[PDB]
Amino acid sequence: SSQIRQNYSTEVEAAVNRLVNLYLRASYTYLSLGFYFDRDDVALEGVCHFFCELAEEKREGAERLLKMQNQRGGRALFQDLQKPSQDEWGTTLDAMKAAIVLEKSLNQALLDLHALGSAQADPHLCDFLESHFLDEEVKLIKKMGDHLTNIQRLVGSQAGLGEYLFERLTLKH
Amino acid sequence: SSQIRQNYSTEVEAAVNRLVNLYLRASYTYLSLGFYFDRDDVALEGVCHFFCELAEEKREGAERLLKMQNQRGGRALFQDLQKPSQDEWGTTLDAMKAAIVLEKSLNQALLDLHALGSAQADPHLCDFLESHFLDEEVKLIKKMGDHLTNIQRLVGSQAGLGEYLFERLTLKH
Amino acid sequence: SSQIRQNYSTEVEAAVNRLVNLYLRASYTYLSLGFYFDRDDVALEGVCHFFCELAEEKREGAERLLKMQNQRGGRALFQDLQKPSQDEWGTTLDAMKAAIVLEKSLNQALLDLHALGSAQADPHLCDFLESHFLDEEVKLIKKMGDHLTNIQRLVGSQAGLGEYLFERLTLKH
Amino acid sequence: SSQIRQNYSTEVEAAVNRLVNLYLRASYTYLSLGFYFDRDDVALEGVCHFFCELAEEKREGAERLLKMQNQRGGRALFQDLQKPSQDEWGTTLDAMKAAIVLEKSLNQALLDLHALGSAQADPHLCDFLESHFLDEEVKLIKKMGDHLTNIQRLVGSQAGLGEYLFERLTLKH
Ligand SMILES: [Ru+3]
Ligand SMILES: [Ru+3]
Ligand SMILES: [Ru+3]
Ligand SMILES: [Ru+3]
Ligand SMILES: [Ru+3]
Ligand SMILES: [Ru+3]
Ligand SMILES: [Ru+3]
Ligand SMILES: [Ru+3]
Numbered sequence: 001s002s003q004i005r006q007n008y009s010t011e012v013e014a015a016v017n018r019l020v021n022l023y024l025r026a027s028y029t030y031l032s033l034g035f036y037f038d039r040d041d042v043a044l045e046g047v048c049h050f051f052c053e054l055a056e057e058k059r060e061g062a063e064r065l066l067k068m069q070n071q072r073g074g075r076a077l078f079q080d081l082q083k084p085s086q087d088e089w090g091t092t093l094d095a096m097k098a099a100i101v102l103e104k105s106l107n108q109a110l111l112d113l114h115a116l117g118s119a120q121a122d123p124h125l126c127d128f129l130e131s132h133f134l135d136e137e138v139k140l141i142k143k144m145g146d147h148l149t150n151i152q153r154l155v156g157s158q159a160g161l162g163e164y165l166f167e168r169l170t171l172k173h
Numbered sequence: 174s175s176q177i178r179q180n181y182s183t184e185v186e187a188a189v190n191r192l193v194n195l196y197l198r199a200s201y202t203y204l205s206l207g208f209y210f211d212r213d214d215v216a217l218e219g220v221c222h223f224f225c226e227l228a229e230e231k232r233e234g235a236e237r238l239l240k241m242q243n244q245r246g247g248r249a250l251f252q253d254l255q256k257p258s259q260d261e262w263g264t265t266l267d268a269m270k271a272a273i274v275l276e277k278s279l280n281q282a283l284l285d286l287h288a289l290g291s292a293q294a295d296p297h298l299c300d301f302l303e304s305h306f307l308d309e310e311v312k313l314i315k316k317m318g319d320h321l322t323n324i325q326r327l328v329g330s331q332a333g334l335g336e337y338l339f340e341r342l343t344l345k346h
Numbered sequence: 347s348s349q350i351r352q353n354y355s356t357e358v359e360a361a362v363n364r365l366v367n368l369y370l371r372a373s374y375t376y377l378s379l380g381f382y383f384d385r386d387d388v389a390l391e392g393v394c395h396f397f398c399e400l401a402e403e404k405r406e407g408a409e410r411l412l413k414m415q416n417q418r419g420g421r422a423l424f425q426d427l428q429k430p431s432q433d434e435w436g437t438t439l440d441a442m443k444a445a446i447v448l449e450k451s452l453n454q455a456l457l458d459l460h461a462l463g464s465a466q467a468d469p470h471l472c473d474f475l476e477s478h479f480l481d482e483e484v485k486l487i488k489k490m491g492d493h494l495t496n497i498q499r500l501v502g503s504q505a506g507l508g509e510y511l512f513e514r515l516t517l518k519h
Numbered sequence: 520s521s522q523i524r525q526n527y528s529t530e531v532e533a534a535v536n537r538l539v540n541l542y543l544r545a546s547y548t549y550l551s552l553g554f555y556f557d558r559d560d561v562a563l564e565g566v567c568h569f570f571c572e573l574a575e576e577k578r579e580g581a582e583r584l585l586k587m588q589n590q591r592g593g594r595a596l597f598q599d600l601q602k603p604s605q606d607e608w609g610t611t612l613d614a615m616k617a618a619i620v621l622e623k624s625l626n627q628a629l630l631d632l633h634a635l636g637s638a639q640a641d642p643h644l645c646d647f648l649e650s651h652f653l654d655e656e657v658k659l660i661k662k663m664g665d666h667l668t669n670i671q672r673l674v675g676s677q678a679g680l681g682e683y684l685f686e687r688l689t690l691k692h
Contacts, residue, residue, distance in 0.1 A: 107180075129296070149386060156505075211416045214668055216666075216669055253426050253429050352623055352626055417657050472649075
C-alpha cells in the first residue's frame with residue numbers, strides 16, 4: 001500500500017487510468033494509420049511518417065500519465081485496447097479528418113480531467129496537465145487544422161495530383 | 174471558418190483581441206518615451222534604451238497573444254492604436270511613474286482575462302497567461318519599482334546630477 | 347529646446363512626422379496580413395512569413411525616420427494609428443495586390459517628401475531618403491510585382507493548387 | 520594643365536579650396552582645445568581625447584576634399600591658417616559651446632557649397648558632400664548637442680563635481 005498518497009482522490013486516480021487507455025488507444029489508431037499509408041497501393045511516405053510519429057507521441061503521453069499516477073501514489077490499472085475504428089483509412093483528407101476527430105476527443109478528456117481536478121482542489125494534477133498536455137494538444141490540433149486546409153485546397157479538380165504534392169511538399173519524408 | 178476551435182468562448186476571444194490592442198498601445202507609448210529620451214535637449218541614452226527595449230517586449234507580447242488566438246481558432250480583430258497620452262514625458266522620474274501606471278493597467282487586464290478564463294473553465298488560456306505573461310509582468314513591475322526608488326533617492330537637492338548618475342550607473346548604455 | 351537645429355524647416359519636420367505615421371500604419375497592416383495567413387482556415391506559412399517580415403521592415407523604417415528627426419533637432423509627434431483597411435485579406439493574389447497598392451502610396455509619400463526637401467534646399471534630408479528608402483522601396487515593389495506575376499500565372503484553372511505551389515516553391519517557410 | 524577636367528566650374532574649385540582652409544582651421548582649433556584640456560591646471564583627459572580625435576577628423580575631412588579637387592582636375596591652393604579664436608577655452612561647457620558654434624559654421628559652408636554645386640549642375644560634387652560630409656556633420660552636431668545637455672544638467676549647484684563626472688562617465692579616457 002502507498003505511504004505517500006496525499007490529496008489524490010479516487011476519482012482522479014480512476015480518470016487518470018481511463019486517460020491512459022484513451023492515449024494508448026490513440027497510439028494504436030495512429031499505428032494503423034501509419035501502416036495504411038505504407039501499403040504498396042497507397043504509398044504516401046510523408047503521411048506514413050506523420051502518423052507513425054503521432055503513435056510515438058501518444059504512447060509517450062500515456063507513459064507520462066502512468067509515471068505521474070505512481071508519483072502520486074495511485075495504482076495503474078490497464079484495460080483492453082480497443083482496435084482502431086477503421087481497417088482502411090481512405091484518402092489523406094479522410095485520414096486527417098479522422099485524426100482531428102480523435103484529437104478533439106482526447107482534448108475534451110484532458111479538459112474534463114482538469115475540471116475534475118479543479119473541483120477536487122488538486123492543483124498538482126491541474127498543473128501537470130497544463131504543463132505537459134493542454135498546450136501540446138492545442139499546437140497539434142492547430143497543425144492538423146493547417147494540414148487539413150492545405151489538403152482541401154489541393155483537391156479541387158485533380159485529387160491525385162493534390163494528394164501527391166501535399167505529401168511531397170508539406171510532409172517530412 | 175475554423176475546424177479546430179474547442180472550449181474557446183466568444184468572450185475570451187474578444188478580450189484577447191482587446192489585450193492585443195492594449196499591448197500594442199503600450200509598445201507605442203514606449204516608442205514615444207524612448208525617442209523623447211533621445212532628444213538633443215534630453216539626451217539620456219540609458220533611459221532611451223530602457224524604453225526602446227520595453228517597446229519591443231510589449232510588441233512581442235502582442236504577437237504571442239495573436240499566435241495563441243490563431244492556435245485556438247479565434248479570429249484576430251485589430252482596432253486603432255491610440256496615440257500615447259503625452260508628447261513630452263518630463264523627467265526620468267515622471268517617465269518611470271508613467272511606466273509603472275501603464276504596467277499596472279496591463280497587469281490588471283491580464284488578471285481580468287485570467288478571471289474570465291477561470292470562470293469559463295478555459296484552462297489553456299489560464300496557463301498561457303500564467304506561463305508567458307503574469308510572472309514576466311510581476312518581474313518588470315518590481316524592476317520599475319526598484320528604479321523609481323533609486324531615482325527618488327537621487328533627487329534630493331541636485332536633481333540634474335541625480336538624473337545623470339542614475340542613467341550612467343544603473344541603466345545599460 | 348534644440349541647440350542643434352539647422353536648415354531644418356517646420357514643413358519638413360511635420361512631413362517626417364506624417365511619414366513616420368504612414369510607415370507605422372503600413373507595419374500594422376502587414377501584421378494583420380501576416381496573422382490572417384496564419385489562420386487555421388488559410389494556413390499559408392510562407393505568405394505569413396513574407397508579411398511578418400514586411401511588418402518588421404516598415405517598423406524599422408519608422409524608427410530610422412524618428413532617429414533622423416532627433417538628429418536634426420526636430421520633435422517627434424505621434425498620431426493614432428489607424429487600423430488596417432480590411433479584417434480579412436482574401437486570396438494570396440488579393441493580398442499581394444493590396445500590398446503593392448500600399449507600397450505605391452508609401453513610395454509617393456517618399457517622393458513627395460524628397461520634392462519638399464529639394465524645394466527647401468535640405469540636401470541632408472534628400473540624401474537620407476535616397477540612401478535608406480528610395481532604392482529599398484523600388485527593390486521591394488519589383489519583388490512584389492514579380493510575385494504578383496507568378497501568382498497570376500498560377501491561377502488559370504486550378505486556383506487552390508496554384509496558391510499552394512506558390513507558397514511552397516517561391517516563398518521562404 | 521589638366522586633361523581630365525569636366526563639368527567642374529571655377530566657382531566650385533575656389534569654394535572647395537576655401538572649405539579645405541575652413542576644415543584645416545577647425546582641425547587647428549581642436550588641437551588647441553585638446554591641449555588646453557591636457558594642462559596640469561585643467562586636467563580633463565576625456566575632454567582632451569574628444570578634441571584631439573576631432574582635430575584628426577577635421578584634418579581627414581580636408582584631405583578628402585583635396586583628393587577630390589585633384590580627382591576633378593582642379594588645383595589645390597592653400598592659404599594661411601588663422602590661429603584659433605581663443606588661447607584658453609574656459610570650462611568644458613564653454614568649450615563644447617565653442618565647438619558647436621564651429622561645427623554649425625562648417626555645416627553652413629557645406630550647405631552653401633552643395634547649393635553652389637546644385638546651381639552649377641555638378642552632381643558629382645553634390646554626391647561627394649552628401650556621401651562623406653553632410654550626414655557625418657549632422658551626427659557630430661547631435662553628439663555635441665547631447666553632450667552639452669548633459670554638461671548643463673550637471674552644473675546646477677556644484678560645477679566642479681559635475682565637470683569631473685561628465686569627463687569620467689561620458690567621455691572615453
Ligand atoms: Ru514509411
Ligand atoms: Ru509509418
Ligand atoms: Ru538612443
Ligand atoms: Ru531608444
Ligand atoms: Ru507563421
Ligand atoms: Ru507571420
Ligand atoms: Ru591627453
Ligand atoms: Ru588630447
